[PDB]
Design a protein around this ligand. Sequence first.
Ligand code: SF4
Ligand code: SF4
Ligand code: FES
Ligand SMILES: [Zn+2]
Lengths: 111, 123, 42, 93, 204, 688
Amino acid sequence: VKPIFSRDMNEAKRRVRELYRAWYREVPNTVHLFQLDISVKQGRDKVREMFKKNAHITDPRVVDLLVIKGKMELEETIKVWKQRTHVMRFFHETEAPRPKDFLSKFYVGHD
Amino acid sequence: ITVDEKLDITTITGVPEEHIKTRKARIFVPARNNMQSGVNNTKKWKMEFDTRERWENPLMGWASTADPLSNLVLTFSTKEDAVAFAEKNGWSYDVEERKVPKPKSKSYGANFSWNKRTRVSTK
Amino acid sequence: PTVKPPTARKFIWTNHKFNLSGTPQQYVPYSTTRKKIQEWVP
Amino acid sequence: GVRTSPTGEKVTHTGQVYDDGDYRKVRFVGRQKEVNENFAIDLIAEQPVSQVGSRVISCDGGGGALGHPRVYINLDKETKTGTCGYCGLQFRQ
Amino acid sequence: TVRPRNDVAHKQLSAFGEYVAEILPKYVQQVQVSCFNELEICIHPDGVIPVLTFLRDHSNAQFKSLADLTAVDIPTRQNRFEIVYNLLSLRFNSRIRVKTYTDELTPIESSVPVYKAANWYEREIWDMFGVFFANHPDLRRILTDYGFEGHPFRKDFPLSGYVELRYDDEVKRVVAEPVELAQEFRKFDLNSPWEAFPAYRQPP
Amino acid sequence: SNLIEVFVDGQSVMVEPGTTVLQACEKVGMQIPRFCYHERLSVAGNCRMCLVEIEKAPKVVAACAMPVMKGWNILTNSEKTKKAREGVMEFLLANHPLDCPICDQGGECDLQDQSMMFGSDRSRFLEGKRAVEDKNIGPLVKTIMTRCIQCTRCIRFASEIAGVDDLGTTGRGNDMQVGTYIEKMFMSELSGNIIDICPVGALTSKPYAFTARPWETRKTESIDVMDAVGSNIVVSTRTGEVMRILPRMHEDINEEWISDKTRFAYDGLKRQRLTEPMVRNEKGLLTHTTWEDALSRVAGMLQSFQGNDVAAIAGGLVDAEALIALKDLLNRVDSDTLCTEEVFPTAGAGTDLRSNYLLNTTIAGVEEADVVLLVGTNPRFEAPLFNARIRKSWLHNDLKVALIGSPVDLTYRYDHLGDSPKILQDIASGSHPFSQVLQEAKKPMVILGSSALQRNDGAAILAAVSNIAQKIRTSSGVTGDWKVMNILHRIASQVAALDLGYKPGVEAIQKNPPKMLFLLGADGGCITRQDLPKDCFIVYQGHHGDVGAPIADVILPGAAYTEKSATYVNTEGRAQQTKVAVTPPGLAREDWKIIRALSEIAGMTLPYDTLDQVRNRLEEVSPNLVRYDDVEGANYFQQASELSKLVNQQLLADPLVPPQLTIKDFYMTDSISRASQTMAKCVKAVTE
Ligand code: SF4
Ligand code: SF4
Ligand code: FES
Ligand SMILES: [Zn+2]
């Protein structure tokens, strides 16, 4: 009667576990074959900070859509497409951000 | 076959960077202009976001802005639909009630009054 | 200059300038902003 | 036409002298500032006021060739000559 | 009279407004619209494959060709996306529109087994709008960047984007991305007062 | 029960008897093109554009004139109705100059929008075009009468609502000039609304003149400050600059008009304003400094001093977010002694109970009144929107208005009951010219002005209003839900400060002198070098600093009403939320952010992170200022009258005269409009 995308409630979490298992084994492939850039340890920390943002699990449809999206943005580097270090760099390194404070943001210029 | 119906609040999956939580939406119906006496811009809901910092550019003379989400006007048919869309996006909304024009009995016979002081002087 | 001459306007320059390049007397931008004035005096 | 600033850079059509404390003056160091020799303000007064016999006259540049919408100007006022919204041309009587 | 266009084949084409409607499913038909010798049918999302197998190799209606697979994004409705399958008959010389409706995040039955051209347009909708399609082989990003966030068309986000400015800065090879400053777009508030058209205004 | 069923294009609609054809068409959604008719103004059939053909009739009738009777099929899209609209449009534009490029009105023009949609594509016209000599009406309104379509709408505006009587038709046929014959300099209240009344580019704003076209400027809704009524006006911004301020239609805020002193004074915020934080140097003069350094010099004194020796004097252009933050910075860090700039009585439960602090009767509730017994105040000078509402209540319905306390020029009648405080005391008892009319009334209302309240006889005028109102309403006057006493505050912040919990008047600062005073937006003459008998250390925080700014040690720049996005309280008792239209110039910051950063620099830090956090804390202190655009009436008026009557005070000998009792007096006032290129030019020509 209703669409379910891929999985219903519980199995969607196991798909994230399947996605984390595959993407954890692909970080040595994005250093040796691709480019060294930063580090193997920091590359695995780059995974953890991405999934910590998605702490709001409430629907099976929202989780599964993020899995399908995850099976393209992280599948891009498995079957290597044109990125050449300029693309596929998720972590911001060029720009320095201002900390969230009432005394720091007001001194610099915000809102 | 296989429905798996789940009732929960809407969440943003295809969302940009940290700017949604800070910016506040103002879903309010646009007021009629002072000079233009026509009602066509009204009777349709508009979700316009609050304007951020704007400064004159050192390059030339134009006023360039750093804020990306600013120059967009959305259309809505119902007030309930506009409020549901704002919750679906993630941004906090401050809805304003539609100011309907009050029906005033403006009759031509009142201009030529005898007892009343509503008599029009010099046409 | 033989059959049909351009009409005089007394506004157009008599001597034509060369191409604007990396050499001096080149193009530069400016703004007409009068700016919002600030008042502070002892 | 326009009066030269004590700083150095020439004033444009409007009074636009750059401030002494302002950093936006490096642009005109080395390369010259493009300022027009013919100023439009002085050219309005330079053109003579034409005389009209009738009450109302219509202003035109030169028909359909020179760009001007046909505007009729009332000439009832004796003091201050009547001028159209487009040209700086003035009319009397 | 000179200046307007004349219509005569409207009544001949209106017969399909009865013909496809006389098949009569609540699974398919719903609402039928016909104007200026063109047909618009809006169909429930659950059935798309069984709808497009019909009008294909059928003796009365032989279309066989899919030219456009456009999608309409509209925030007014609860069902946000109105995907339009535009079909063209080469045997009968007529055009039909197979409209659908999908909300924020629900899969529709994709027409990969029906049409072999659909898959390229199906990837385009998933890029621009974010509408996922079930039973689709290899769903990839074509128009977007290989590290692009959000969906490029959606009326939720601005015209200028978010990762628009790209520098060749202090790092030798890496091109910068996350800077969001740009020159301001002059959004002109142009919308004429007074309704110009009768037979369009609805009572509240 | 008084309803008529009629047909618009064959569709059923129910209407009240007496309503016009155009009023019936508005119900279904139709809008007939018009030029004379207005929602607030009277009815005249001048232009004859709103022609609509009803079947079984030889002649086409106007939508203005005809009242709807039983059984009419109004055809809007018939063969004759289209030909009628196309015909008259050609007549309207036959004698109208080609001025659209030089016209101040662009896309907003009524002739442009209607001629494109309803009028013909081409004109038959060959020869003609009349030319009209322009008359200089005023320095505030530019007048080019060549473009005027002789519609007669401004003439009705000046006569019926403004009540000035200067404009009039002179001549016949083509040679008809709209305007004053005697070449009189027309300057009055509500004169900045006649530019919006005129549908064409005949009347336009002279201070605005030429800056942007209607389509180019992005519109933003905001509540106008520096006015008692608090009118709603959509402020237009053309790339980070406030170009024009135009009023929007609203039921509560008088009508669809803004004040003349509020609308024309747009340039005042842009001419002179504090950009950088200025601290007093060792030499003497104030010098520009860094934001971190200027805050550290202010926090060094603020954290050091503790007790009753620290008091803030704020009033004028102050916000509700500024009020909630300054109270949290003073009462928590030290002893609370915060004072308001505007003088208001607090002897007999003044600050306590909402019924005594603000006006009990609604701003729209002035229309449903039997007799208005106004105190010694000038409605023409203070709040022009409220004076228009009182005039509209006098014009539409028969209601005798009485104003006792120094005679002044007014749009209404007269009926003044002397000029004495003793006459007000006699009015409380069995008076001869008054009291008898107050006893026999449906719903009487007494409006007490803040102009007389801010004097020596503060409690004496308050007890006369409470004693007079208590003896009238409770005895026989009021029959259910009706207000007796009303108080209209002159200052914009005065209504907001009393509701929050600020001590009214400068008496709190005069009794005990503070060591360091952080005066947030000081405009009124309350704090001075002679007033404070110690080391100054005065902190000035507010936009546009001309008065009060030289007598300060550490001045911090703030945002104006167009800059800061915060709530504002109305005279009736309504919280209207203002939105940010333009970014603050220079290094200036918001009012809510300025106090939170001062607490962060010091030891004691206030619980505030964002604008939502400041709104939540303001909701806890007062629930009335939490809900936007929703006003609720205060209960228990008899309990407040009994507490106020306990105090004994002698009445003053001097008559209750307003400080602003002139037409030129309401041009340069409250310091915010004093530093303006438009206001100073208007005030100089008002006398000359
Ligand atoms: S009033 Fe309207 S039609 Fe007339 S010149 Fe001005 S913009 Fe043009
Ligand atoms: S000036 Fe404007 S409002 Fe007055 S009569 Fe002329 S067109 Fe009408
Ligand atoms: S608008 Fe009705 S006659 Fe002019
Ligand atoms: Zn001309």
